[PDB]
Amino acid sequence: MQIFVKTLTGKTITLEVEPSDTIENVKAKIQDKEGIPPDQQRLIFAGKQLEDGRTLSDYNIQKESTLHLVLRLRGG
Amino acid sequence: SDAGINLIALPAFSQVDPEVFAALPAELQRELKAAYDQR
Ligand code: NI
Ligand code: NI
Ligand code: NI
Question: Can you say where in the cell this protein is located (chain B)?
Fold first, then answer.
């Protein structure tokens, strides 16, 4: 299925995923496209910061959903 | 060169989508507001 990842500017990244994919797997697909390490990626859905050990279906993230991406600032 | 992290992580203030900033948790919002004031 298709989901969208969207930064502070509204820049949108299209991803092909499955509901069984973990959040770490999503951040790995994001690294393949954007070149940002997954530890520096923070993904947000329904106002909550997502945990890497859980899956998309664990957060009820369905097709055509939008995740928001906020990178970590230096030091943090 | 270490300055490259925040060049990507913190886009210019005028380029922030208000609907995206609003979708973030409150702690993330405060962290970003504080970082923009230190620019
Ligand atoms: Ni980018
Ligand atoms: Ni992780
Ligand atoms: Ni917008």
Answer: Nucleus
Interface contact flag, B25 A6, Cβ < 8 Å: no
Number of domains in chain B: 1
Q: How far apart are CA A65 and CA A45, in angstroms?
A: 9
Question: Any chain A CB within 8 A of the CB of B13?
Answer: no
Q: Under a CB-based contact definition with an 8 Å cutoff, are residues A37 and A31 in contact?
A: yes
Residues of B in contact with A42 (CB under 8 A): 28
> Are the C-beta atoms of residues A62 and A2 closer than 8 Å to each other?
no
- Say how many residues make up chain A: 76
CA of A34 to the centre of ligand 1 (A): 5
Number of domains in chain A: 1
Q: How far apart are CA A21 and CA A24, in angstroms?
A: 8
